Design a binder for these strands. Sequence first.
RNA 1: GGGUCUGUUUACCAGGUCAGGUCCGAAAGGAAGCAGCCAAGGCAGGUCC
Length: 69
Amino acid sequence: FDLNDFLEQKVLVRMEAIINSMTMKERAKPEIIKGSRKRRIAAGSGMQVQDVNRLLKQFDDMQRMMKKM
RNA sequence: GGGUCUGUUUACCAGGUCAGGUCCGAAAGGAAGCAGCCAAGGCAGGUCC
């Protein structure tokens, strides 16, 4: 389960916006998204880094469910 | 090494177009710009000077 699968599910518009700024590698293996990329992703989507942090957290929570849900 | 072809590779670090999203503007309209793709560079192989 990854961002691709999370993407496949207004607050919803921005979320997409954040994911539409990542590379394929980032979507498939989210844990590689650190300081420099979050920043690339936030500016690239007109969002704040903390916006990206929340997005990744909501994704994390779900990724946890997949295997225990 | 240079021309060229083929495969492959490359988040941001001043290429093109820039979906989506964003910024400025009362509006008319402006501007920046991620991913993609393309270009380009890297690694090889063919071929040629």
